[PDB]
Structure formats: C-alpha cells, structure tokens
Design a protein around this motif. Structure first.
Motif, short mmCIF file in Angstrom:
data_model
loop_
_atom_site.label_atom_id
_atom_site.label_comp_id
_atom_site.label_asym_id
_atom_site.label_seq_id
_atom_site.Cartn_x
_atom_site.Cartn_y
_atom_site.Cartn_z
N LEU A 254 29.94 36.87 39.77
CA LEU A 254 31.01 36.30 38.97
C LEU A 254 30.55 35.63 37.70
CD1 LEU A 254 33.94 36.07 38.45
CD2 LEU A 254 34.12 34.24 40.06
N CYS A 258 31.85 36.66 34.05
CA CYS A 258 32.51 35.64 33.24
C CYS A 258 31.62 34.42 33.14
CB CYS A 258 33.80 35.23 33.91
SG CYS A 258 34.60 33.69 33.30
N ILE A 283 35.23 39.14 46.68
CA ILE A 283 34.63 38.49 45.52
C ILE A 283 35.02 36.99 45.62
CG2 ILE A 283 34.59 38.36 42.98
CD1 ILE A 283 35.34 41.34 42.89
N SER A 284 34.15 36.13 45.10
CA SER A 284 34.39 34.68 44.99
C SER A 284 35.83 34.37 44.51
CB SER A 284 33.37 34.05 44.03
OG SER A 284 33.77 32.73 43.62
N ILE A 287 37.17 33.83 40.78
CA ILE A 287 37.52 34.90 39.86
C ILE A 287 38.89 34.66 39.24
CG2 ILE A 287 38.63 36.55 41.46
CD1 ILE A 287 37.23 38.82 39.97
N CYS A 290 38.88 32.52 36.01
CA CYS A 290 38.45 33.17 34.78
C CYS A 290 39.41 34.30 34.37
CB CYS A 290 37.04 33.71 34.88
SG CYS A 290 36.54 34.23 33.25
#
Ligand SMILES: *[C@@H]1O[C@H](CO)[C@@H](O)[C@H](O)[C@H]1NC(C)=O
Ligand SMILES: *[C@@H]1O[C@H](CO)[C@@H](O)[C@H](O)[C@H]1NC(C)=O
Ligand SMILES: *[C@@H]1O[C@H](CO)[C@@H](O)[C@H](O)[C@H]1NC(C)=O
Ligand SMILES: *[C@@H]1O[C@H](CO)[C@@H](O)[C@H](O)[C@H]1NC(C)=O
Length: 302
Positions: A254, A258, A283-284, A287, A290
């Motif tokens: 991530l 970003c 995914i984290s 996200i 951002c």
C-alpha cells in the motif's frame, strides 16, 4: 435485385449475408455499402467505377485476399471514411488507401507483411484495428504509425509482437497490445504518449518493468492481467480501473501504491481486480483512505 436499397435511406445499399461471390455494380449515388458476410474473394475496379461518393464500405466476413484487390480501387474514393476488411484472408496491409480514411478495421486476417511507407498519407486515421494478425516487431520498427497524428485508437492485440511498438503518435488515447509476447517496456516509453487513457497489456510476459513506468497522467484503464508481475506499483491520480488478475503478486504494498495522501486531490481509483495472484489476505483497510472512491476489489481465489 441482388441487394436492397431502401427508398427512405436512399444512399444505403445492403448486400450483406447473401452468399455473394462478387461485388455487384454499385450505383453512383451510394454512400454506405454493406457487403459483409458473403463469399467475396476479389475487389475489382469494374464494380466501383461510378461510385465516387462512397463513405463507408463494409467487406468484413468475406474471403478477400490481398493479391485479389485491384490497385487503386479504394484509393480512388476521395470521400471514403470507413473501411471494414476484418475477417478476411489478407496477408498484407492494403495499399494504396485514400487519405480521407478515418477508421480502418483489419482484424482477423493473416497480415504478415507491411510494405515500407504503406501508412503514409493516412493522416486522418483515428482508429486502426489490426487485432488477430501475424505482425512482428520488424514490421513496426521504423515508427510506421508516427505520421498518423490524429490516431486515437490502435488495436495490435493477438499478434506476434515481442516488443512495445516504437514511435507511436502522441495523439494516442487507446492502445491494445493484449496477447502478444512482450516481456519488457523500455524506460521512457510513455513520455511522448501523455494522452493515453486506456492501456491493455493483458496476456503478455511482463515482469521486471521499470519503477513508475505506469506513472501516466491521463490513464483511466490499466489492464495488465495474465502477466508475470511480482509487485504493486504507484497508482497514478487519474486511474479508475486496474486489472491485475493472474499475475505473481504475493502482497499489494500500500505504501508503494500510495506514498502520500493529498486531501485536496484524491486519486480516482474505483476498481481493482487481483484474483488468481498469490495473496494470503485482503489488502490493508487503509487503502480506502488513499483511494476513497474504491467501490470494488475483486479477490476471487488465489
Ligand atoms: C459508369 O458510367 C460511365 C460514364 O461515366 C459509363 O461509361 C460506364 O459504362 C458506367 N458503368 C456502369 C453502369 O456500371
Ligand atoms: C482530413 O479532415 C479534414 C476535415 O476534418 C479535411 O478538411 C481534410 O481535407 C482531410 N484530409 C484528407 C487528406 O482527406
Ligand atoms: C491469442 O492469440 C491467438 C492467435 O494469435 C488466439 O488463438 C488465442 O485465443 C489468443 N488468446 C487470447 C486469450 O485471446
Ligand atoms: C513496501 O515497499 C518498501 C520498498 O520496496 C519496503 O521498504 C516495505 O517493507 C514494503 N512494505 C511491505 C511489503 O509491507
């Protein structure tokens, strides 16, 4: 009698899907001519001799061979804007063509030859479709598209390319190179393609691409599925749709995606597809801070 010319659309002639073997004689008032889905092999001058106002010819889904197109038959038509020759048996790029041409569709042929200077004068071309042909790098190496300075869309998918075509015109907005054997992208490749909106490179062999190769200021769709990418990369501000399926990604980093949040201009990202990678977990959740416009992240199985 072989074709149908509606009295209410008097410049149109329909000769399609009629098992025609030859192109009938075209009346001089015809502007749109439909000959698709026939058994035509040749394009002869005698059929078109008085048909000086043709703007659109559809000869797709026939059996036309390059060697049976008479010299000059298309080139003498000064108002021809659109020419469909997809789904034929063409072995070479047709020449000469009229300079008025705007859209040229040559998909699903056997094009393996492209004569030096064949594209010259096609300065009005906006759309060129060469998908499903036999093009290879040596045919494109001399920057053959470079003078097509209105070209918006170039389809070069399902050919035999091993490299990114060099010297593409800076007008270009849509580039398909899907289903070739491209393995790298040279460093400053996209510098003179600032208008690129859609890049389709799925089903190639991409692996160790340059850091920030896809930092592209007007890109909206980036399709790089079915390649050999190991890492995520910096997502540019304009991007909306990102297709990363069927690569070799273990984690979507991530911070690389970003590195900084600017709350005055949030990135436009809306859709990520990452199925068939090697991800263990989603995914984290950061996200979404951002990329606040993300509406879907498709994970499938891994
Ligand atoms: C086309 O018109 C010319 C006159 O310019 C004539 O000589 C020719 O025979 C015509 N072709 C047809 C009717 O197919
Ligand atoms: C290309 O298009 C413009 C109109 O949009 C026209 O004025 C020009 O003559 C065309 N060029 C050729 C070579 O047909
Ligand atoms: C790749 O192209 C070949 C012909 O060049 C075709 O048969 C094959 O289906 C293509 N693959 C995809 C995924 O489109
Ligand atoms: C993200 O990328 C940077 C540089 O490649 C690295 O220092 C960092 O450990 C990565 N973080 C991960 C994989 O969580």
């Amino acid at each position: 009698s072989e074709c149908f010319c509606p009295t209410n659309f008097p410049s149109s002639m329909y000769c399609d899907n009629r098992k025609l073997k030859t192109i009938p004689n075209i009346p001089m008032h015809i502007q749109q001519l439909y000959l698709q889905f026939n058994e035509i092999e040749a394009v002869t001058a005698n059929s078109f001799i008085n048909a000086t106002h043709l703007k659109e010819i559809n000869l797709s889904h026939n059996k036309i061979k390059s060697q049976k197109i008479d010299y000059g038959v298309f080139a003498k038509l000064p108002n021809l804007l659109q020419l469909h020759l997809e789904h034929n048996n063409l072995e070479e790029f047709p020449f000469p063509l009229p300079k008025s041409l705007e859209r040229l569709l040559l998909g699903y042929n056997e094009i393996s030859k492209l004569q030096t200077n064949a594209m010259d004068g096609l300065v009005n071309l906006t759309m060129l479709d060469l998908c499903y042909n036999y093009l290879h790098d040596s045919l494109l190496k001399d920057k053959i598209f470079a003078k097509m300075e209105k070209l918006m869309q170039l389809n070069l998918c399902s050919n035999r390319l091993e490299s990114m075509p060099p010297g593409l015109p800076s007008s270009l907005m849509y580039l398909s190179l899907e289903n070739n054997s491209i393995s790298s992208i040279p460093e400053k490749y996209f510098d003179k393609l600032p208008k690129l909106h859609t890049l389709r490179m799925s089903h190639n062999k991409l692996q160790d691409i340059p850091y920030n190769i896809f930092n592209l200021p007007n890109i909206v769709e980036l399709s790089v599925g079915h390649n050999k990418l190991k890492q995520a990369f910096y997502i540019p501000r304009n991007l909306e749709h990102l297709y990363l399926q069927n690569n070799e990604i273990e984690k979507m980093n991530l911070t690389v995606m970003c590195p900084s949040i600017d709350p005055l201009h949030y990135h436009h990202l809306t859709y990520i597809r990452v199925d068939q990678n090697k991800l263990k977990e989603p995914i984290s959740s950061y996200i979404f801070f951002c990329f606040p416009h993300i509406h879907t992240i498709y994970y499938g199985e891994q």
